[PDB]
Design a protein around this nucleic acid. Structure first.
Length: 242
RNA sequence: AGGACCGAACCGACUAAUGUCGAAAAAUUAGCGGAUGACUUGUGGCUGGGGGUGAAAGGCCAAUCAAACCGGGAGAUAGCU
RNA sequence: CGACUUACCAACCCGAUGCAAACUGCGAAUACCGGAGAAUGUUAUCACGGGAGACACACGGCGGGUGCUAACGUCCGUC
RNA sequence: AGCCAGGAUGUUGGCUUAGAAGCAGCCAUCAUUUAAAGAAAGCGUAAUAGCUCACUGGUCGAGUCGGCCUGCGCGGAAGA
RNA sequence: GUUUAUUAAAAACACAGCACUGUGCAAACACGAAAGUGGACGUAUACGGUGUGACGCCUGCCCGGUGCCGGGAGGUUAAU
RNA sequence: UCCUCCUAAAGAGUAACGGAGGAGCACGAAGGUUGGCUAAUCCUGGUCGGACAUCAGGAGGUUAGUGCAAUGGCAUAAGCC
RNA sequence: GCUCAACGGAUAAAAGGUACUCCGGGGAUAACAGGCUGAUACCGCCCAAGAGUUCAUAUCGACGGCGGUGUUUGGCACCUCGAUGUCGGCUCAUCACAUCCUGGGGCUGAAGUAGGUCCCAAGGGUAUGGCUGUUCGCCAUUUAAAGUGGUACGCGAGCUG
RNA sequence: UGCCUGGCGGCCGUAGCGCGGUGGUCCCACCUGACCCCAUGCCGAACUCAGAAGUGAAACGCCGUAGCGCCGAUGGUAGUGUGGGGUCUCCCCAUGCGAGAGUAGGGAACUGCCAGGCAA
RNA sequence: AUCUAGA
RNA sequence: CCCGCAGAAGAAGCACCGGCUAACUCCGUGCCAGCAGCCGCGGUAAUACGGAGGGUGCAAGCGUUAAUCGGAAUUACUGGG
RNA sequence: CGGCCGCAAGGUUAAAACUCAAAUGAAUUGACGGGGGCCCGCACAAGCGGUGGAGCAUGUGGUUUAAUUCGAUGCAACGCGAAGAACCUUACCUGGUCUUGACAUCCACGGAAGUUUUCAGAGAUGAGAAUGUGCCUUCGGGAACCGUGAGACAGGUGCUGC
RNA sequence: CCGGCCGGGAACUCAAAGGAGACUGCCAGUGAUAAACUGGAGGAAGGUGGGGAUGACGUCAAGUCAUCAUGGCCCUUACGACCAGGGCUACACACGUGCUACAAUGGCGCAUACAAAGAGAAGCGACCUCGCGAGAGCAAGCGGACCUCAUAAAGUGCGUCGUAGUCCGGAUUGGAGUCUGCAACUCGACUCCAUGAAGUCGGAAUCGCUAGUAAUCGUGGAUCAGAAUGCCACGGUGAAUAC
RNA sequence: CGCUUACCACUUUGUGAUUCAUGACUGGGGUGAAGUCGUAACAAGGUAACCGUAGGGGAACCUGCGGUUGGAUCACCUCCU
RNA sequence: AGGCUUGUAGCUCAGGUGGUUAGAGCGCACCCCUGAUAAGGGUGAGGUCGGUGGUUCAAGUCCACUCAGGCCUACCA
C-alpha cells in the first residue's frame, strides 16, 4: 500500500487547481485496477483543487506500480485564473511513501532495567535519613535513565519511573520514525520550482514527456483519465534494467 | 561639610578555638563592626500585667514572659501516673 | 426484485464430565430443646438481698473470614 | 552385552525440477537378495560422500531387560 | 543604622522618597466610667493611619465577590 | 439508625474499613368479606401488524405474579377480577 | 411540633491554628533501630519452544514451575516514649563468599594474544579528583583490581554538622 | 361376600406420566332447549334452570405392557464424636455413628364409611 | 475586500 | 654580410556574425541544454544556445581575465549644480 | 558604531558589506474614479407575461462505457456546428480484411464496355458459369471502360485558429 | 340545376409594371434678425411615417486549421481504405433553453363563421369506398392565380361539469396496430384501447417586452424515405403602461 | 689584565588602548516567476495624504495635538455680492 | 493511590438533574449574487449520545463496570 500525497508547487492558485487534476488522474488509475483510495486529508485551494492532498491508497502492490511519480510535474497550459489568455507554467509535486506498519514501541523487559534504589534528598525527617524511597531506572540498550523521587513509598516512585520510562522509549523512537518521514519526503518532494523534475504536461501541444526514457506520448486525454499504463510501463522496464 | 574614610578610648558581638560537673547561670584569647552620631553614657524621673514599652523578635519588663512576682479563692481539677 | 452456496461460528434438546459462601429434587456425625429411669456428686440448681472485681487478654487444638492457604498478624465460634 | 562379521537396491526419486539423496518440507511408508536387513534416528555436508543403527551368522555361553507397589538413603542445599 | 540579652544580625525592621485615606480645630485618633491630658501652646505646606521603600524607566485590564463611599425612591423593620 | 442474604461451624446468638444489595415510604383503596379465575416463555394459523399490540388452538406447569431490597413463602391460594 | 441522621438523642444555640507552645499519660499507638513473615528485592535450580550459518542446552532462553538469603521498600506493632542520638563524611575496623584481582580447573561458537561461562579457593589486595550536604550517580584519568554485602544499612560517653 | 358406579375419605409419587385396548341396563360424562330463578367486563362456552333423543367420541374408570418418573438394599467410599499419631495449610490410627451417588432389584397401589346397579 | 506567475 | 644546390617544396591560426558593432542562412534541441559587457535570447519554425556552410575582424598571433586612465562636464579650477 | 548633548524619549555628527539597472522630475495621448457637468439605451422606474417549483423535449457539464466521435464553454458556449444519429451520415468502438490502394496522372501488357447467374461468407469479398466481341485504322493501334506490375505518389475529419 | 356555375362587362378586390406622394412643403410663436423646437392646417400618412437590409477606425493573442485553402510538423503494410454489429439516445446528479399544465376569462360534446404565407414529379395527391383511427384500393388534376396539402384555430350559439387532484393535467406503462425504409431490438414517428403519476402559480434571485408591440391562437417552409416541443416565416384576436 | 659604576639589547611581571578573527542566542536589512493574514498608499483610493511627536495596536497602521498643499467637490439648498 | 468531573454532529457546546421528543454557532453539500473568489442570500443533510452490563413497559439520562482527558489531595515523622 502507499500514501499518495500531492502538494502544489509554483503557481499557487493554478497548480492548486491542477493538483486537483493529478489527484483525479491517479484516482482514475486506482479505480481502474480496483484499489481503495481514501482522502485522509485535503487542504483545499482558493479556486479549486488543493495545496496538499495526502490520500492513502491500499490495494495489491500499490507501491511498486506507483513509486515513480515522486518528484515535480511541470504544467504548461492556459490557466483558469488568467484574464489575458497566455500560457503559464506551474508545477505540482507528488510523494509516494510506502505502508510501513507498526511494532510494539517499548520492550518493557525489566531484565534490561538497572533499578537503582538510593536515599531520598529534601525533607521528611527521620524517614528520609533511613528509608531509601528514590529510584533510578536505566534502560540499558537505549541509555535513557529517569529518576523518580516523588513520594514516600518507593513503589509509587517506581511505577512512575516505569511509566515515564516507557513514554520516553516511545517518544524517543517516534522521533526516529518521524525523523525519517521528512528525511525521505524532503528528498523525494522536489524544490517545487518549475525546473523540470520528472515530467511535463503540455496542453497546447498536447504532449507528455517523462524526462527519463524520454517518452514522447502525445496523448493528454489518454492520460487525464488514468491510462498512464504507457507512461509507467517503460519506466518499470528501464528500472528492472538495473 | 559629612547619619564621609582609617583608627585608640568607648559601644557592640560576625568568626574560630577553649570552656561545657567551667575562672564565668554567655566568659576568655587572636582576629572583627561603629567610632561627630538615628552615637554612647552618669544621675533623677515616667509608663504596671490582657497592662507597659517595642527601628517588630511574640523581643524586653529584676538570671522568670504567647501574659511577671508575691499572697489569696485552694486541699482547684485530674476518667491520668 | 428471482435466487445463490459455504474451507465457516453457533440457540434450544440429547449423551457424557466438572465447580459454587450468597445453588438444593438429597443428607450425616455432633450440637440443642423435652420427657422417663437408676447411680454418683458436702444443693452442684434457681429466686431474692449485701459486697465486689472486671469489660486492654495471650497462646495452643479444631471450624472459618481476612492476609500471599505470610506473620509470635487481625477478627469470630468452641475447647 | 562384547567382538575380525554382514548390514544394499532403483529412490542423482518423482515431488515446490534452486539442492535434498535417510539425514530444511511433501509423504507414501512397496518389495527384492535372502543365513538376514531399511524404500530409516543422529552427526559431516552445499547436498554428496564419510563415520555410525535397528537387525542377521560363527564361537564364547548362561540368564538378561524394563516397568508397578514400596522401606531407607543421595544430590538439588550458599552468610555475615 | 536596628534586631531575637543567654544557639538566629540577616534578604528581616527602619529609613529618606511616593501614594491613598481621615482630620475645619472643643480636630481626627489615643489614655481615661469621668473631670482631664496627649495630639500641639501645632492649625491642612499641619497632624494621625495604612501600604510601598533611595534613584532611573514605569505602574496595564476587571466594581461580578468582600469592604468603603454617595444616594434616597420602593419594600422589610425596634422600643413606642 | 433500620431491613435481607452470606460469613455463622444443620437450634438461638456471633466480629471485622468482610462479601452483596435496599429503607427514611406507598394505599381510602393496592384493607375486609363473599363469589369467580390461573401464569411466564415458545410453536402453528391469522388485516394493515412488524422479533415484539389484539384473536384462536397447542406445548409448558409457576421459568409468572407478589406496590419497592433479598430471603422465606404462597394454588384452599398470600397472584388476577 | 426535630435528615435531634453522630439516629439510646450531652446545647435552645459553636469553626480552625500552634514549628511560640505547655501539662497528665502510653511503647495500650506511629517515625529510627532489633524482631516474626518474605508480597517486594537479589541469588540459585526445573522444563523447553526458540535466538545462535544447520544445532535446545559455548552463549542467551519465552510461556510456566520450585526454592534459598534477611540486604531493599513493605506487612504486623512484639521491645524501648520516667528518651534505645537519627543521613553522608573522617578515624578505625571486623566477619560472610553468592570472588573484583591474584591461584588451580571444565566447556567453548577455545588457532594465537585476548575472551565468554561454570566449578574450587577468603591468604593478601581492592583508586585519586570535578559536580551535589549527599549516599547513589555522571564524568576525567588511572589500576593487577577500583567486589557484593552483615556489623543499630558498624563506629557522635571517637570527630564533624 | 364375587363384579361394577358415585360421594367422602385414609394415604401421599412402589400410588404419578406414557403406550395399548376396554364400558354404558343403571351411574357418570357428554348432549337438547334456553319462558322464567341466573349469568356474560362479548358470548347459556363457564355459571343457573327445564330435561333424555342420542353417544361412550372427548373425558372419567378399569385392565394390560417397562418407555419414563418413582422406591431401593448389601458391601465399599465420603464425612465424623471421643482418645492418641505424623513425612501439617492436609492426612493417619483406635473407636463409635455412618451417608449421598450408582447396582441387584421393587413397581403400572393398598384401604375404610355410606349410597345406588347387578349376580346372588 | 482581493484578483499570483510566460508578450 | 654573398653565391651554389634543389624543389611550392618547410611555414595560419584565433575571435566574432540580435542592437550597441563590421559580418547570415539551414539543421539539432524546446525556459531544457546552454550563452551573456549591458539590453536580454531558449516556453516547438531561435540571424542571440550547439554544429555545418558562408562571411567579418585581426594575424604569428588572437581572445578572456585582472589593473590604470579615458568617454565620465558621473567630484566640474579649465568645466556642474 | 563611536563621540558629544539629554533625566529619559531621543537629538546631533555619520559610515560599510550587500542588492537592483534602475529610482526620479515635468509634461503628453489614453484607461480608470465608490471625482464633476451634459446627454443616451426596456437601463431603471410604470405596467404585462415568464424562467427558477412539476412532468417531459432538447443542449451541456459530470459520471459511466469497449465506444459514449470532434468542436463551441462569461457577456459574445449551452433547441450552438447539426437546415433534422436505426442503416447511411460517422469521423468513435469491437471483429474481419486490403495495400500504389475507395480517390487522380504517368509507364507496360492484357482484357470491348455492358448484361445475366450460381456456391461460400455477417458482409466487404473470393471462387465461378453464361454473354456480347460494336463506334477507326499507324491498323505491332487509336478513343470509353477493365485487370495485373512496381515506382513517382495518392490519402489524413492527424496536430497547431498562439 | 341560386353553383360568379353561363352569356358576358373592365368599374371594383386582386395581380404586377410605370408613375405621382411627404420634402420642415405652408402658417403662427420661439430663437443670436441662424440652425432648429412646440402647436395648427392640409394630407392615406408629419416630421429619420412603422419595419428591414446596410457594421467606420478598430477591440478581443475572440470562433473555426472539422465547409473549403495554405505554411509547418507528423503517419505513409498506416492515424490511409473497405465491410457487418454497436455507439454518438448510455444515468447516483447539476446547469441552460423550451413544450404541456396547475384549470370554471376553463375542459368536454354538437352546429358555425373569418386569413396570410408558402411547397409540389424515382412529388403534391383529390373523388369514391373500406378502417373506430393512424391509414389502405382504384385513381382525376397539376411542374400550378385554375389542380393538391387545406377541416385554420382562438371566435360565436347551445348544453354540460360546480371546485374536486376533479369530466383539470398528461407523464409513465401494458396490449394491439399503421406508415416509410432492405431493416423500427438498442433507437423512429403516428393511431386506438386500458393506464392515469408529479403537479393547487412555485424560495433566494431572475428575463423579454412601449404597440398591431407583449400575450395568446392556429398555419406554412427549409432539412428530409421516415423523424421536431427547435429554427425560419405567416396571419387571427389583441392590451396595461412611461411620473 | 681584573674589579666596580653609568648608558643600553634580549628577556619577565602589572594594567590598559586598539584592530583582526571567533561566539550559544538575538535586532534589523536584502533577495526569492508560487504561500498565510489583511488592504495602509495611488481617483476625494472609498476616514484627503504627508511631516514632527506621543499613546495604543496581529501587521500594514489607527487616534490625539500642531503644521503643509506636494488635497479633490464648490447653480445642490438660499440669495446679497 | 483516592475523590470529583467531564465524554452529545466534522470542531466547540447546550440537551443529562427531569426516563418515553436530539438542538445551536462554525464547518460541509446544493442553488443564486459575482467577470471569478471571499462576503452575502436561499435550501439541505449530518448522531445509535465514549465502549460493557443490569433495573425498567423504554436507557442518552438511573446504579455498577471500566476506557481516554482534567482538576484537587498524597501530610506528621
Amino acid at each position: 500500500n502507499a500514501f499518495l500525497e500531492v502538494r502544489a508547487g509554483t503557481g499557487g492558485d493554478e497548480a492548486a487547481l491542477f493538483a486537483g487534476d493529478l489527484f483525479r488522474m491517479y484516482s482514475r488509475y486506482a479505480e481502474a485496477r480496483r484499489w481503495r483510495v481514501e482522502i485522509m486529508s485535503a487542504s483545499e485551494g482558493e479556486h479549486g483543487g488543493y495545496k496538499e492532498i495526502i490520500a492513502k491508497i491500499s490495494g495489491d502492490g500499490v507501491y511498486g506500480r506507483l513509486k515513480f511519480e515522486s518528484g515535480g510535474h511541470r504544467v504548461q497550459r492556459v490557466p483558469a485564473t488568467e484574464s489575458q489568455g497566455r500560457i503559464h507554467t506551474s508545477a505540482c509535486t507528488v510523494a509516494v511513501m510506502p505502508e510501513l506498519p507498526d511494532a510494539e514501541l517499548p520492550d518493557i523487559n525489566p531484565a534490561d532495567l538497572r533499578i537503582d534504589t538510593f536515599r531520598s534528598s529534601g525533607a521528611g525527617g527521620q524517614h528520609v535519613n533511613t528509608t531509601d524511597s528514590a529510584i533510578r531506572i536505566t534502560h540499558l540498550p537505549t541509555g535513557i535513565v529517569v529518576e523518580c523521587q516523588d513520594e514516600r513509598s518507593q513503589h509509587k516512585n517506581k511505577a512512575k519511573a516505569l511509566s515515564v520510562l516507557g513514554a520516553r522509549i516511545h517518544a524517543a523512537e517516534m522521533a526516529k520514525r518521524q525523523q525519517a518521514e521528512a528525511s525521505t519526503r524532503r528528498n523525494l518532494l522536489g524544490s517545487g520550482d518549475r525546473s523540470d523534475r520528472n515530467r511535463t504536461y503540455n496542453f497546447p501541444q498536447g504532449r507528455v514527456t517523462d524526462h527519463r526514457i524520454n517518452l514522447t506520448l502525445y496523448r493528454l486525454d489518454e492520460v487525464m483519465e488514468g491510462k498512464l499504463d504507457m507512461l509507467i510501463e517503460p519506466i518499470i522496464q528501464e528500472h528492472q534494467a538495473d
